[PDB]
């Protein structure tokens, strides 16, 4: 048997800070104003506005990702096939994971629009993605010749259409890598873990045990860098090969209280 | 002019987890059960009971200290004289700081009991310190030939005695390095920042009748790895050369919810 993994992105800048882009950018020059912010930010076609719509990970989000990769390495588990949602936070999580794993640099992050989160009409969000070349320029090890399974527009979709996207991409990834037999990881969003379970269960013949896809099956999102694991064939949910994680918060010190 | 810094220790294992010692130790052997726990625990005379009394930093706690050292390095600021409370969390913060700084191996951690937190009779605690030799074996760059300014016992003390301890050690450190003129850091507890300000203002002759020392001047403790800065002579409270930090929490995932 081989492993298929699903990993939620790490801690997000936009959820950790307030109006960070206007605070940190003086004109078009980014200034790091907190130790948990990125050291620098790569150019992107959408400018600093792109980063408002498409947040980076914090330093801790990179670290969270690296700890998972390190956990896999310690467990003696290799990875060959890495797919990420096109959201910057997911690509960066993939990279931090690869860094912790010490994967050979020939292992590339394949950016797969099939893995992007639900484009809910009730939550119109600005969609802005960095291109493979822009992500490589940033120093991310992205596959420049990967042709994705799913082509996605910027428009809202139904829930059915969403789950079909994810299922096509995940099942195609698993099917296409079967001859090689290397381990697979999907790096995406909180929902990705449940999508992986649904997709791989649906590869069996008998559909009687298979539950319909639901948004909102659970009330809370799985934590940052939550790791789900299956082994197969046949595909079964199992304990991942490294432990889970927990960290606490830490607020921002104001030196002026020292008077 | 010269820098003197004060740094609170990073995130503590005992405040982040519950009964982590009985949970992780199986037949006197430590097993890492969370990614944010230490990879291994160094031998100490007090064994697992010692770790109950004298918590390690979490992985994040090391990373927080590293971010501060890195931030100092980015700002072009060197450090020559490093003093740490004998609490394991403080010595580990000192090492993470030095790792981020890429300090020369000749820059050693001087374990100074003068810097230890208040021993309050209302709050009796087990006291169990790792020896400089045990710390060096753990891989901490501790100064073996350091002779501490303050010898300290296991007994509760009055608030006056506590502040006197801290001031003796901090003034001695600042007086004894003046000729050399290297930058100094005191790595300790939340109170260490206010102790440094009080000790260095008392080295001035400009303004006598400063604020009496107070436990409880503020309602909340400064954040993990909160960094305070003074420059002098004459000693002025100033902005540190690197930014503050903030991170959010992240809970522990239970893969069994996937089934
Ligand atoms: Cl913003
Ligand atoms: Cl400009
Ligand atoms: Cl590998
Ligand atoms: Cl969700
Ligand atoms: Cl405990
Ligand atoms: Cl032990
Ligand atoms: Cl305090
Ligand atoms: Cl002075
Ligand atoms: Na860049």
Curated annotation (Swiss-Prot), chains A, B:
Molecular function (GO) terms for this protein are: ecdysteroid-phosphate phosphatase activity; protein homodimerization activity; protein tyrosine phosphatase activity
**Annotated S-S bridges:** none
Expression sites (tissue/organ): Detected in non-diapause eggs, with highest expression between 2 and 5 days after oviposition. Not detected in other tissues tested.
Instruction: Tell me if Cytoplasm is a UniProt keyword of this record.
Output: yes
The main place the protein resides is cytoplasm
Q: Which domain of life is it from?
A: Eukaryota
Q: What does this protein do?
A: Steroid phosphatase which catalyzes the conversion of inactive phosphorylated ecdysteroids into their active forms. Shows high activity towards ecdysone 22-phosphate (E22P). Has lower activity towards other ecdysteriod phosphates including 20-hydroxyecdysone 22-phosphate (20E22P) and 2-deoxyecdysone 22-phosphate (2dE22P). Also has protein tyrosine phosphatase activity.
The protein's name is: Ecdysteroid-phosphate phosphatase
> What gene is behind this protein?
EPP
